[PDB]
Write a protein that binds this ligand. Structure first.
Ligand SMILES: [Ca+2]
Ligand SMILES: [Ca+2]
Lengths: 132, 128
């Protein structure tokens, strides 16, 4: 053909490299209500909606991988359909410190309201809604 | 109360050079670079985006250990994979392997792999 238009639909998954898989899995299940799943040859992922995060253990990663794997190097913003104030209470109840929020920020689709906190490796997590 | 996440809205990539990165994702992955906020830059696709930070620039808050080349991303395309692979190859980007059978969030996928300018690993895939 001629003039093919390259187009991406969405991000299906990403790989986080973490200090300790069991710590990370427990954290995301309890704090973000994600589902830990086992797939392939004893691999672990966390499901949210219809996408997922694959976990690699630092020092035991699979190839190929990021050129420079690094714990605590991710900065992710997730949309929740729950009432944000209830989500924030839920996160705090799990013994997590809210760094900042609720505050107006920018999302892919326009204005969002967000709050922020750290995961066990120091990854920055932003939980957000498009709801007023 | 039942905590639950719908989807990922965006993530921040820390890169050596924003202009190099922009040119790559626009040409190779057909993304649109847009400005927002106070001189911030993002790459748009579907209903998501990737925010760019240049290593060394002051920003807060951010990842505890920002690192260029530390991301490992799988994108779905609705194009025929062989067309997408020809496109990428034609932009002068080395294909590492593909097409190969892999696992996506919602079942089996077919993929190919390459790296971006900083070494981030990029998997482009289809469910078809
Ligand atoms: Ca953000
Ligand atoms: Ca993958």
């Amino acid at each position: 053909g001629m003039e093919f238009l390259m187009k991406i639909s969405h991000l299906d998954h990403l790989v986080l490299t973490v200090a300790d898989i069991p710590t990370t899995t427990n954290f995301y299940e309890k704090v973000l209500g994600m589902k830990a799943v086992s797939f392939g040859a004893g691999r672990i992922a966390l499901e949210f909606g219809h996408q997922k995060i694959n976990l690699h253990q630092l020092g035991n990663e699979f190839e190929p991988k990021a050129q420079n794997v690094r714990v605590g190097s991710a900065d992710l913003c997730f949309i929740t359909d729950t009432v944000l104030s209830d989500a924030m209470k839920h996160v705090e109840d799990q013994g997590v410190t809210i760094m900042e929020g609720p505050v107006k920020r920018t999302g892919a689709q326009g204005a969002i309201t967000s709050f922020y906190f750290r995961d066990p490796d120091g990854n920055l997590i932003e939980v957000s809604t498009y709801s007023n």
